[PDB]
Amino acid sequence: ITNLCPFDEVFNATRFASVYAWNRKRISNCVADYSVLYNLAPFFTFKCYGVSPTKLNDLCFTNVYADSFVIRGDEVRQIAPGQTGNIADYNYKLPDDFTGCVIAWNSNKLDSKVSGNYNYLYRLFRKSNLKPFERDISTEIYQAGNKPCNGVAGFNCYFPLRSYSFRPTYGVGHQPYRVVVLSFELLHAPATVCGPK
């Protein structure tokens, strides 16, 4: 019916997104051919909470999503439908309906440049309590009222943009990991992606 799915360009990107601004590429009307995605390199995460990846090729869906971002090592475990953490409930949260995969991989082989990785940040400071999809794109200051700051020095407020310090001369646990998740949802609409039968 359609051509091959463009997933080949999702797992091979030239510049991924950040945590405060993450991609939300909607995929629909393609083929679910995971035969190539199954026999990939020995990555560190190939878990799919929804269903088995073998039977996924015979399951129809209306529209699927793809969200790619970059986190540290100790933050990979926080990606779960309901869990505490500095990123799990502050910057990247998922409701209790995720039926996709949490496939991720390390890419600390080509980023060996000791010059300051001040390009990626996760916005540790936030005031999100509900709405698990509460994103943030502006460059405001961390405040909660009560005569907020209006300067640059501060000393009572702070600039809510904490960049990473990824350096090649580090050990395990604090390494960069590119994580791509596939959000699935079904509404009152005919299905588009089913997979080769």
Partner: antibody, heavy 122, light 112 residues
Framework: EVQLVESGGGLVQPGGSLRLSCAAS????????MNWVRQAPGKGLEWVST????????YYADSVKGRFTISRDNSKNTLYLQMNSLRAEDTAVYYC???????????????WGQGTTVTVSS | DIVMTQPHPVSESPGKTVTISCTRS????????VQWYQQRPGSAPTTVIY?????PSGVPDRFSGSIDSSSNSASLTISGLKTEDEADYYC??????????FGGGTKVTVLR
Amino acid sequence: EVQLVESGGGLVQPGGSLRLSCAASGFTFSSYAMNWVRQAPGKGLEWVSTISGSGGSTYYADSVKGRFTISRDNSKNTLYLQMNSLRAEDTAVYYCAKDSSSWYNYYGMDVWGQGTTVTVSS
Amino acid sequence: DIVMTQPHPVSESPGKTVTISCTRSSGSIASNYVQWYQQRPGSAPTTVIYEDNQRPSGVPDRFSGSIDSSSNSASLTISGLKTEDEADYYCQSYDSSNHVVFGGGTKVTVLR
């Protein structure tokens, strides 16, 4: 920096077929999502549909779902739009716009082009 | 989801700075960035910012963009009113379903 030429904007009776071509020029056209947008006379802009850069992912809006298709050619890059079973609300000026680089799909939009006026009368 | 409502067209005398507001229709502004476009009557729309907020493709300092969480709206500031500024403008963004949402439009008029 993007040339856009189509066939025409001749009217058609309700329940017809129309093919719009959005062949462009330049040098950077490998993988860029293309968005078909419309604007009704006396009304603001209205997004119609979109397609990914590689031509795999393609979807439409809610009111124009089921009777419109959009495809993309790469080696002779061109954005084809097939419109079937037109209604009285389809009379509008249509445009085909580019976007930013291949990483972000919902961030960045380059020059659009010219567009053409399609009318549906009886 | 819902088309973002855009206020009525405005007019301004030359030599001043104008501000256009764009309010979100439903939900919150906690989504992707909101951009603007300059469409002259009878001409094709032209973007005011190239990618996110930095130096666009030919507008040196006229157009600038900001986001206000207190009012939960986008603000387009246009300094140095010229004869080529009297035209229609639309604020466009994306929703949580990868749909391109536009605004109602606003005509900026220059007094002669």
